[PDB]
Amino acid sequence: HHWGYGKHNGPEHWHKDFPIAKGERQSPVDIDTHTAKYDPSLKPLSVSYDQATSLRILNNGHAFNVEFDDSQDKAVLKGGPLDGTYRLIQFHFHWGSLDGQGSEHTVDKKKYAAELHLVHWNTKYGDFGKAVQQPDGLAVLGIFLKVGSAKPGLQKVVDVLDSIKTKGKSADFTNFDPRGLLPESLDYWTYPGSLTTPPLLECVTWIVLKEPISVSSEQVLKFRKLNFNGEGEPEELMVDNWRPAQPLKNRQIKASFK
């Protein structure tokens, strides 16, 4: 015990250990599509994942992370609102107990069934731990998931989840291609924000794609069989591991598209 997503340790309690939870640039936020303004100076997003090297998948007790080798510029995000080069370190998801909830960002108050976060750190700061101390340290690519057709490129992830059911379990997860999780369009919204889990550091340029990917009910059902607890502990399904929308405060959300 420790922050989490339960009644006694969930998002409304995080500010006691992490006072930045009530900060000026917290995430996620609701994206009001009518208020977001098209910014013609935003540059196309460059997602360069052809040399991505996945290594491992880990249940960390709040989500599962697919981890990459970030010891060289293999998988990088550049362009869009970003200055410089950001290296992929891990992706993970947030999801609900029901299809009507699960995403962290919302779009005109709509909640999606889940949200994928591809986390990248700015190579100008040398390593992730230094990057999170900087206002432009991370770039997180957020992708909404809706339930409908299966996402073929997700299936290798869902099929390994039985081997990392409980907190602290990991499994080898090499040769996974994250290009198979992207939608067709790279149109996006962007704003300055934070990590959505403690320590809630205000170090993220968010890039949230407009186009959701579709996953099947069977795929998200397997997410919901994971556990927040460790092996041999009372079972607590890993569901509703999302932080709700936070006040936008003095921020503007920009759109890459008209």
Which residues of the chain form contacts with Zn ion (CB under 5 A)?
117
- Say whether 13 counts as a known binding-site residue: no
- Say whether 120 counts as a known binding-site residue: no
Please answer whether residues 1 and 77 qualify as being in contact, where contact means their C-beta atoms are separated by less than 8 angstroms: no
62 is catalytic: yes
* Nearest distance in Å: CB 132, Zn ion: 13
Q: Give yes or no for a cis peptide into 152 (omega within 30° of 0).
A: no
CB-closest chain residue to Zn ion: 117
- Say whether 106 counts as a known binding-site residue: no
Residue tagged active-site, from 2, 15, 34, 62:
62
Nearer to Zn ion, 195 or 253 (CB): 195
* Nearest distance in Å: CB 154, Zn ion: 16
Nearer to Zn ion, 78 or 117 (CB): 117
Bridge-based pairing of strands 76-79 and 86-95 is antiparallel
Please answer whether residues 150 and 131 qualify as being in contact, where contact means their C-beta atoms are separated by less than 8 angstroms: no
- Say whether 166 counts as a known binding-site residue: no
- Say which residues have a Cβ less than 8 Å from residue 195's Cβ, sequence separation at least 6: 27, 132, 138, 201, 203, 204
Per DSSP, the residues of 78-93 read EETT--S-EEEEEEEE
Nearer to Zn ion, 85 or 103 (CB): 103
- Say whether 8 counts as a known binding-site residue: no
* Nearest distance in Å: CB 54, Zn ion: 17
* Nearest distance in Å: CB 175, Zn ion: 23
Nearer to Zn ion, 117 or 210 (CB): 117
* Paired residues of 180 in beta bridges: none
Please answer whether residues 58 and 67 qualify as being in contact, where contact means their C-beta atoms are separated by less than 8 angstroms: yes
Please answer whether residues 124 and 87 qualify as being in contact, where contact means their C-beta atoms are separated by less than 8 angstroms: no
- Which residues are part of a known binding site? 92, 94, 117, 196-197
Residues that are catalytic: 62
- Which residues are part of a known binding site for Zn(2+)? 92, 94, 117
- Which residues are part of a known binding site for substrate? 196-197
